[PDB]
From a paper:
The primary energy sensor for motility in Escherichia coli is the dimeric transmembrane chemoreceptor Aer (aerotaxis receptor), which responds to changes in oxygen concentration indirectly by monitoring the metabolic load of reducing equivalents in the ETC. Aer is dimeric and composed of a cytoplasmic N-terminal PAS (Per–Arnt–Sim; named for the representative proteins: Period, Aryl hydrocarbon receptor nuclear translocator protein and Single-minded) domain, a helical transmembrane domain, a cytoplasmic HAMP (histidine kinases, adenylate cyclases, methyl-accepting chemotaxis proteins [MCPs], and phosphatases) domain, and a C-terminal coiled-coil kinase control domain (KCD) with high homology to those of MCPs. The sensory module of Aer is the intracellular PAS domain that binds a redox-sensitive flavin adenine dinucleotide (FAD) prosthetic group. The flavin undergoes changes in redox state that trigger conformational transitions within the PAS domain that propagate to the KCD to transduce Aer signaling events.
Here, we report the structure and biophysical characterization of the Aer PAS domain, making use of the triple variant that combines all three flavin-stabilizing residue substitutions (S28G, A65V, and A99V); hereafter, called, Aer-PAS-GVV. The structure of Aer-PAS-GVV was determined to a 2.4 Å resolution by using a molecular replacement probe derived from AlphaFold; the structure contains two molecules within the asymmetric unit. The PAS core of Aer-PAS-GVV forms the FAD-binding pocket and consists of five antiparallel β-strands (Aβ, Bβ, Gβ, Hβ, and Iβ) and several peripheral α-helices (Cα, Dα, Eα, and Fα). Flanking the PAS core are an N-terminal coil that extends across a cleft in the β-sheet to the Gβ–Hβ loop and a C-terminal helix that sits above Gβ, Hβ, and Fα. Of the two Aer-PAS-GVV molecules in the asymmetric unit; chain B is considerably more disordered and has higher B-factors than chain A. The three substitutions that stabilize the Aer PAS domain are in relatively close proximity to the flavin. S28G is on a loop between Aβ and Bβ, with its carbonyl oxygen hydrogen bonding with the amide nitrogen of H53. The Ala to Val substitution appears to fill in a cavity otherwise produced by M61, Y130, V83, and L133. The A99V substitution increases hydrophobic interactions to the dimethylbenzene ring of FAD that likely serve to increase cofactor stability in the pocket. The side chain amide nitrogen and carbonyl oxygen of residue N85 hydrogen bonds with the O4 and N3 atoms of the FAD, respectively, and the imidazole ring of H53 forms π–π stacking interactions with the FAD pyrazine ring.
Author numbering: 8 to 134
Amino acid sequence: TQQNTPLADDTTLMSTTDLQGYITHANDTFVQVSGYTLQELQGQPHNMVRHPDMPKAVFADMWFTLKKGEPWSGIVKNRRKNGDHYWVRANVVPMVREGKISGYMSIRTRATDEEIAAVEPLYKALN
Ligand SMILES: Cc1cc2nc3c(=O)[nH]c(=O)nc-3n(C[C@H](O)[C@H](O)[C@H](O)COP(=O)(O)OP(=O)(O)OC[C@H]3O[C@@H](n4cnc5c(N)ncnc54)[C@H](O)[C@@H]3O)c2cc1C
């Protein structure tokens, strides 16, 4: 199925990746919503969650901003294990340890559907 899974108001997905984007930890809500357990996520890139409809230009601008040491945010469409889609607004922030960017943490809330209708014409003009 490709249908939408409506998320609750308190939905707060949080995860941590290394400098190459491979997941190092994931909170319990990310495990429940994504359908993947913690051990299946650890040591895996964050693209197993990526929905194929998401443009390449969205992630290219994120890593350009992240590699500059700056935080990034945007409306993201994700994919579950069964394959249902759910929109979020990712808030990826570079993690700094001893003056060095050690990784990136992100807190993903539920996307208001009005942010979806504003990027869908832009997303089909991006990829
Ligand atoms: C903390 C964190 C949380 C994330 N959460 C999500 C999430 O919830 N959903 C989601 O879909 N993605 C998420 N991502 C992005 C994920 O890691 C992938 O980069 C994304 O899915 C795109 O990878 P891809 O190979 O599928 O597409 P690609 O074809 O690789 O993406 C297009 C462009 O992305 C750029 N890019 C991707 N990875 C890198 C990299 N490591 N270094 C430099 N440039 C790069 C390249 O310029 C490339 O041309 C997250 C990343 C981080 C760091």
